[PDB]
């Protein structure tokens, strides 16, 4: 058997971050990665036509200080997602160009409804502990409702409901009826709230890595060399003995003092445990699916939308549109002009049955309508990735919690099981579901093990992160009117 | 590599029924069973104190003809669960003895609400195809709501809502808020409806197997001999070559023309697939958890409840009661007096913290109050099984579908993946979640492979089952009043129109 201090299961960002921290501490780490590549839910494809493209996780932003610090240490640079020109909200078959993070509404009733919806999500969020959403004072009430129910309750307008729906679909690549209100509200609040999560400028979509996010995992793999074992899917973990035994599908045996599980919680199901997992984890890892998304990048000779003062961001309401949300994916040099769009939630399932060429045509025709340009009909290249297909991801971006699960099982997610500690973005308390959360969880799990080894004190397991100098956070602000305008039922009570 | 025609993954009733059918058709079958035993979610414990006790699936009933036929063929007999004396509905700290399948109410408004709740469950069920619940006209609308939301819409009394909630908890060992309304309405409909599923006499809980339901799998294992491989958890299935390769955790390799997956759908995750599963299945097997239950059996010197004219059936409403439902589990001979109780859904999680001795005390104190009997405080023995703990079950009784899942993923539950066919009770179209469904699905998967091999025509894949002559099904009947009494909103609509 191959003997080491710690086996890290999964060479995604979380696993790689944990392995790098343990390696840097002088421990012998081995990273066992199921795939023939590192990066997991990050994947950067290189070819002459795109140079490079992120087909998985890509965007980083302010307050994601851990992924920015790790990336900078590995010699990576960020550039800003193009948000110079106008965003588009495409509503009832018409493009409404706008500026700012939130699509505007003109109907005064609809305005109150929209304002109240975003405000209420953050108000509810403020009662949900980041590290313990199940401790929210109304945790049971909110966990026992879907986002669909909450939105049906809150939204007096079809307009607000459709945008809130799009927002849920885009945040968590799931339907409003699929997810716990408590979990969703937690999810938003632990990314710093509605503005932070939805924003390009000053939000989660501000930046991308020059040369692609896959370089974070690739360059930690560069550092660790042969400590990374590719095509080593872990099938079995045995903690009955002095040392933990980790077995891979190619029959290899790894012996460690401790294990970090840096895989999506539900992919814990692909590992056979001895002894059995405790009851609550045994059931938890069956209750926590990942969302559904196809990431699609259409390439053009030029970023022709910029000529019409569109930045390439499109928010596209309604069932018919295959893509509800797009960003400009042009390279910082202004070449390899491209529009990135997500086919979200049920549409990922619906449109997966088409050919690549058919999806390209649907995307091109949608983009020609929304951008109002025939140039959208003349793609020079197309790249796409359906994350629903991935045995070793389960989906993207992340794990959602259906109604009732977070309150009953949420405490389990990072509870050590003897000498197995849990990393993975799902176990983060901030930007859980992001590359940031991956780094937070990997490093926290690694330091749980350093604490178990008597190498660090309890108070050093959870470590704050200095703010990035390259990507500083600007405060999230609201207006007096946004804070105090009445809800639609608020305005009715008054009449 | 160990070569055969069909590898069956899982030695529950479904995989055993599949293996038996294929074996009986002249094929070379292997059953790869993860545990040191067969039976899966069925498990008959034997010791001197209890003689035998089903800690898992136990009850069979009218319309469950496939399990009755399979059991009978294996030499098993059934007996009737005790329903001679009064059932108890325990609501708000008081016991109300009654007779008949549904706890009665006297309050006329409450009467219309209860009547309408049960009627509406079945009315909605009649819209849902057993084999394609996603084809219900309102499939999307019903699949996008929880049972909590549907009860909130339907129940105009707290009384009906509390009984309805208990009904859901008891039926699918899940909270009303955890489960799809479409799926739950399908689930009840595919068991023959509210009366059939809830009833002891003339329903799902009418009978038990003499000696325990574990005998079904054990006796099929005896028939198959060494073809059943215990402690062979499957870890890897490879379909990239001419023959399917199935690898187990101990590194044994099996080579087959075809595979039957007879494991709960989500436990499909414990297998690494080459090539990868198609997208829809890849995601479906992460979206379908099993419910949560502790089955608890408290033993007494005598079935002392019978002397107070109580059959041992207690429907116990509300949060404090660890157990919401009990049946007399006394042996047919009248000895090893016992009360079987379920600790359901969240209470299974909540009370698993306690010691066995502490759960026993809580159950006795409950039974003492519900039965008005100090004798309930004098148990002689106790057995329990928390199914939440089982790596190779995931829970009990069965897989539930959270909102949105059944319409998006439902269609691939039993869709073959190249040379893998899917059995297990979850893939049944009648009494899915039950031993009956396990038999239906195992046999159907087996016949799919027989069809793929050109051994039978397509029209023999799905086979009807002759009605058991031993457990005849009384039809489910409604009275004129039951069909036409207005809902509470129907009564209110009538009152509106009279005053006009
Ligand atoms: C897919 C996706 C993700 C994504 C997103 C868009 C798409 C289409 N956009 C994002 C974004 O713009 N910014 C961001 O921060 N995140 C975005 N996401 C999410 C992001 O990619 C993930 O949160 C992050 O990559 C998660 O990292 P983590 O390290 O937690 O998880 P992982 O990448 O899934 O890595 C797990 C690795 O484990 C291997 N694996 C799985 N099972 C096994 C077994 N049994 N044995 C060994 N290895 C295993 C996986 O192969 C993977 O490499
Ligand atoms: C647990 C339970 C179930 C139950 C119930 C009460 C409880 C507490 N009450 C019931 C009742 O009164 N009447 C009834 O008809 N059903 C009742 N249920 C449900 C019933 O037990 C189940 O529907 C039924 O037994 C399911 O049979 P099925 O054959 O579909 O599935 P299974 O029993 O889970 O068997 C699966 C087998 O597969 C093995 N396994 C799992 N993973 C693997 C891998 N990777 N490799 C190989 N084998 C695997 C399991 O060990 C199991 O044996
Ligand atoms: C009207 N809608 C928004 C449909 C429900 C009001 C919710 S509530 O009446 O405020 O609960
Ligand atoms: C008048 C308000 C009473 C609501 C009663 N409940 C049962 C709560 C809802 C009825 C739903 S529906 O309104 O019948 O669709
Ligand atoms: C709200 C709004 C937009 C996004 C998100 C949440 I996760 C993300 C990743 C890439 C593009 C866009 C998003
Ligand atoms: C409704 C009512 C009662 C039951 C069921 C559904 I699954 C069954 C198995 C054992 C006891 C009770 C039940």
Curated annotation (Swiss-Prot), chain B:
Enzyme class: oxidoreductase
Outcome reported for the amino acid change (mutating residue 191 to S): No loss of activity
Cytoplasmic membrane side: 1-488
Outcome of swapping residue 385 to M: No loss of activity
Keyword Acetylation tagged: yes
Subcellular location(s) per record: Mitochondrion outer membrane
Positions of modified residues (N6-acetyllysine): 51
A molecular function (GO) term: electron transfer activity
Impact after mutating residue 296 to S: No loss of activity
Entry keyword Amino-acid biosynthesis: no
UniProt-annotated site: Important for catalytic activity, residues: 155, 364, 381
Regulation: Inhibited by deprenyl.
Coiled coil (UniProt feature): none
Membrane topology, record value: Single-pass type IV membrane protein
One Gene Ontology biological process: substantia nigra development
Highest taxon above the source species: Eukaryota
Cofactor(s) this protein requires: FAD
Name of the featured protein: Amine oxidase [flavin-containing] B
Organism: Homo sapiens (Human)
């Amino acid at each position: 058997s191959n003997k080491c201090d710690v086996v890290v299961v999964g060479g995604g960002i979380s696993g790689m971050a944990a392995a790098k921290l343990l390696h840097d501490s002088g421990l012998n780490v081995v990273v066992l990665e199921a795939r023939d590549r590192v990066g997991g839910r990050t994947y950067t494809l290189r070819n002459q036509k795109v140079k490079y493209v992120d087909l998985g996780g890509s965007y980083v932003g302010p307050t994601q200080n851990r992924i920015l610090r790790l990336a900078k240490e590995l010699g990576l640079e960020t550039y800003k997602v193009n948000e110079v020109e106008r965003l588009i909200h495409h509503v009832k078959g018409k493009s409404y160009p706008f500026r700012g993070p939130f699509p505007p509404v003109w109907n005064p009733i609809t305005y109150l409804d929209h304002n109240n919806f975003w405000r209420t999500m953050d108000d509810m969020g403020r009662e949900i502990p980041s590290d313990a959403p199940w401790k929210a004072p109304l945790a049971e009430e909110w966990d026992n409702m879907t986002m669909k129910e909450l939105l049906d309750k809150l939204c007096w307008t079809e307009s607000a409901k459709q945008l809130a729906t799009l927002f849920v679909n885009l945040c968590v690549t799931a339907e409003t009826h699929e997810v716990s209100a408590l979990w969703f509200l937690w999810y938003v609040k632990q990314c710093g709230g509605t503005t932070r999560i939805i924003s390009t400028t000053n939000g989660g979509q501000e930046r991308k890595f020059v040369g692609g996010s896959g370089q974070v995992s690739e360059r930690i793999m560069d550092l660790l060399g042969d400590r990374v074992k590719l095509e080593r899917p872990v099938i079995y973990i045995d903690q009955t003995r002095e040392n933990v035994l980790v077995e891979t599908l190619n029959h290899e045996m790894y012996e460690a003092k401790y294990v970090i599980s840096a895989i999506p919680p539900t992919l814990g199901m692909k590992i056979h445990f001895n002894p059995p997992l405790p009851m609550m984890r045994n059931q938890m890892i069956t209750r926590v699916p990942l969302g559904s998304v196809i990431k699609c990048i259409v390439y053009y000779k030029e970023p022709f939308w910029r000529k019409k003062d569109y930045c390439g961001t499109m928010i596209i309401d309604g069932e018919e549109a295959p893509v509800a949300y797009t960003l400009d994916d042009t390279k910082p040099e202004g070449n390899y002009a491209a529009i990135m769009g997500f086919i979200l939630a049920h549409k990922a399932r619906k449109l997966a049955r088409l050919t690549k060429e058919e999806r390209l045509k649907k995307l091109c025709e949608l983009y020609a309508k929304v951008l109002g340009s025939l140039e959208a009909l003349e793609p020079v290249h197309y790249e796409e990735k359906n994350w629903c297909e991935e045995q070793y991801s389960g989906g993207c971006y992340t794990t959602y919690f259906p109604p009732g699960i977070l309150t009953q099982y949420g405490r389990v997610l990072r509870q050590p099981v003897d000498r197995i500690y849990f990393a993975g973005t799902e176990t983060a308390t901030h930007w859980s579901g992001y590359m940031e959360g991956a780094v937070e969880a990997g490093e926290r799990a690694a330091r749980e093990i350093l604490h178990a080894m008597g190498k660090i004190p309890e108070d050093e397991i959870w470590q704050s992160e200095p703010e990035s100098v390259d990507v500083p956070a600007q405060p999230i602000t609201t207006t007096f009117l946004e804070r105090h305008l009445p809800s639609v039922p608020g305005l009715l009570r008054l009449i």
